[PDB]
């Protein structure tokens, strides 16, 4: 089967600036009829894929002229003259010259924006949860950039590495920032056994961590 | 307008069988070659199968990974495309898209191949605790814990509260998912006005509308 | 009769 290799895996581009992405095949995509069946598709977050380009360089209807496809043989390129907020997503190349019809692994285009420090909020376990024998402590880290961040949980002053679940949102459709949720899960017995619960956030925006806390003993 | 609606996605045990349907409208279904394309969660696209129209005697093609296990078929009189899947494997877990050629894509149907059982979630309100007097903007949340399979949806005030909403993608830990959602509102519309998280888990027919109420002892 | 073709695949 024809192996399709896409590079780079990810790129981060400022709105208004160009982007260029590559697709290379393990064998020539020039078909017996003299045509080259190389397609480019875009999959926006939470959406179905859509075709942008076919036959290396032809634009589908309603696709803006900011997109250009080029290449021949084994080397293909998709270029965006000036990126817009709506170009955010994963781009795939799909060859139809040889059977079976193979895809590239995808190139994730991300929007570059200014740095922003997270806004941190800490949450104690609910009574609905404590009644079941479990206890979860939640920290939301809102509207920050870049994505890379470190959360450290502390129980009465000591670091806990187990029972931690982290999840990031996609970039915000309006400002391109990320948000993150960090949940510490303990048994009801272990939670009552201690007093102060703290989440500490280390991000490039500060040399010192952002610290949020709560104690079961005070209201 | 062109529309393709896939039906049939759901949870099935390894070695099990499942049939998907795709209903086509707004175009000439009977003069088009159709495809199935799948995407494993957080992975890329993979072409699965193709069926040509009647002029080409309904020729069929399959990827090596599904050949002899999957059957692509069509019913032109009903504008329906099908995909019969036998001896399913955990690697078959994916969102399955119905496609006209390479251009018109459906919204997709999720196929989860697993030995884990359907489990409804627990819905926990997240309200500010001990400290925080008045910080002009308040953050509230909902923790949706221990469900299977995906998906779960969260809305706030039935879709009326849409701004300042962050819904975090589910994370799987030992055959159960956990998802969370946050909402940031001014300190004026709450507690004064109503803030409720609406959670749905269609696999277990679960609908939970949790009102957020203040702690402060 | 006559198959529509979006030119995505060859043959
Ligand atoms: Ca060929």
What does the secondary structure layout of this molecule look like, with pairings?
The complex is a heterotrimer of chains A (219), B (217) and C (11).
Chain A (H helix, E strand, L loop, with lengths): L3 E4 L2 E5 L4 E7 L12 E6 L6 E5 L3 E2 L7 E6 L2 E6 L8 E7 L11 E6 L6 E5 L3 H4 L3 E11 L5 E6 L2 E3 L3 E5 L9 E10 H5 L3 E7 L7 E6 L4
Parallel strand pairs in A: 2-10
Antiparallel strand pairs in A: 1-3, 3-8, 4-5, 4-9, 5-6, 7-8, 9-10, 11-12, 12-16, 13-14, 13-17, 15-16, 17-18
Chain B lengths: L2 E5 L3 E2 L5 E8 L8 E6 L5 E7 L8 E3 L7 E6 L4 E6 L8 E7 L3 E2 L3 E5 L8 E5 L10 E11 L5 E4 L8 E9 L2 E11 L9 E6 L4 E6 L6
Parallel strand pairs in B: 2-11
Antiparallel strand pairs in B: 1-3, 3-8, 4-5, 4-9, 5-6, 7-8, 9-10, 9-11, 12-13, 13-16, 14-17, 15-16, 17-18
Chain C lengths: L11
Bound molecules: calcium ion (CA).
PDB class: immune system
Keywords: Immunoglobulin, Antigen binding, immune system
Assembly: trimeric
What does this entry show, briefly?
Chain B is mostly beta strands. Chain B contains no helices and 18 strands. The N and C termini of chain B lie far apart (56 Å).
